[PDB]
């Protein structure tokens, strides 16, 4: 059940691909901002290489910190799937599987309308520790 997912996942050829990496020595993404065009199919490749031996995922939410906390809270209660958002979690646009240190995983999705959206990691504690970034979706 540890698998990618999200309301905007599509089985379509990506128009763009983007790489995200974990910070090697912190509970953070290496990229704290992303930018993509609206209504476009993108493959996001999350490469989790870190020196902590720690797990991480990439989760795009349909909003800011209030929505992020909601999605994060639903994932916190999904220990059997290693803390990814449960399927059909409200306002969770896309996520990768939860990746062990050394693992890489993608998610292919249609970006939402123009606007600003948080991406977070839902492994317990990481979102509260600051593991988040801002996706700005342009026209
Ligand atoms: Cl941890
Ligand atoms: Cu994490």
From Swiss-Prot:
Q: Which domain of life is it from?
A: Bacteria
Q: Where is the Plastocyanin-like domain?
A: 15-139
For binding Cu cation, which residues are annotated in this chain's numbering?
56, 121, 126, 131
The name under which this protein is listed is Auracyanin-B-2
